[PDB]
Each structure stands twice: as structure tokens, then as C-alpha cells.
Amino acid sequence: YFGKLESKLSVIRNLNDQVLFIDQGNRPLFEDMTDSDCRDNAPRTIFIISMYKDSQPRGMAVTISVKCEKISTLSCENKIISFKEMNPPDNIKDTKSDIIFFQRSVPGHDNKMQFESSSYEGYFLACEKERDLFKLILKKEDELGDRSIMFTVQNED
């Protein structure tokens, strides 16, 4: 079971320094943004990372939320990434959740993070280029040192 500890404002970037954002169709996308662009698109680029206590510790348990039309929380339900209209809850009864990800620092860096699905072991949050768009997806670790599943969390310490 999970218990909410705190919620903090953060900006998420891939290894190309492209910042994670919610577009008009509520799609989690990645694009090149200066500190100016990032500031002008603030409700769509500022994410709420909520930290949870876990009765079965196996990585920093987190939810990822954003304020658009309403508070939306990131879900990997049926191994598909989407933002569902809900607040990060105070308590989660199971040992697995479609909105709970395990945040881990990549041994290569103190900056680089990875987000593994609690409900789908071996599946990670990833940036994948589809046509001319950089999309937030859920995938199995394709290879060792895969940069597509690595991110930076800017919470300014």
C-alpha cells in the first residue's frame, strides 16, 4: 500500500533537453523550449510530482500530475500512456498502481532519472519520436544504457 508524503512542482526534460508538456489534445509531448517558451506555456509544462511511502519498498514511489482543464494524473493503464482527470490520492491500497511509478537515479548520473511502472514490471516511461513529434510512451528496456528512458527532473533542489 501507498501513502502520499508530499507534492512538488517540477519541469521534466528528456536527454535532448526537450521539455515534457501537455498539448491542446491533452497529449504528453516533448519539444525544444527556452526558459522564455517554458514560462509562457507554464500551466502545460509545470508538473506536480507527488512522493509516496510504500509498504513494500522497491524504488521512490511517485505520481505525475498537471493542471489543465482540471487536475490530471499520468496513467500507464493497459500499458498505454494518458492523463486521467483525478487528483493524486492520499492512499493507494494495492502494491501496484497504474498511476504509481518508481523514480530511480541512473547509476551513470546523479541528474539522470528513470520511471518504472509499478503495475508493469520492466516497463518504463520513454520519449519516442513518431513522425515529427516526440511522444511520452511506456516501453520495455530496449537495450543497456537506453537514453530514451532517461530524464532530468528540474525541481531547482
Author numbering: 1 to 157
Original paper wording:
Interleukin (IL)-18 belongs to the IL-1 superfamily and was first discovered as an interferon gamma (IFN-γ)-inducing factor in sera from mice with hepatitis stimulated with Propionibacterium acnes and lipopolysaccharide1. IL-18/IL-18Rα/IL-18Rβ ternary complex formation juxtaposes the intracellular Toll-Interleukin-1 receptor domains of IL-18Rα and IL-18Rβ, to which the adaptor molecule myeloid differentiation factor 88 (MyD88) is recruited presumably with the aid of TRAM6. We determined the crystal structures of IL-18, the IL-18/IL-18Rα binary complex and the IL-18/IL-18Rα/IL-18Rβ signalling ternary complex at the resolutions 2.33, 3.10 and 3.10 Å, respectively.
In addition, two isomeric forms that originate from a cis or trans peptide bond between Ala42IL-18-Pro43IL-18 in the loop are equally populated in the solution structure. The flexible nature of the segment produces a variety of architectures, as demonstrated in several crystallographic reports, including a loop with a trans isomer22, an α-helix with a cis isomer21 or, primarily, unobservable flexible loop with a trans isomer2022.
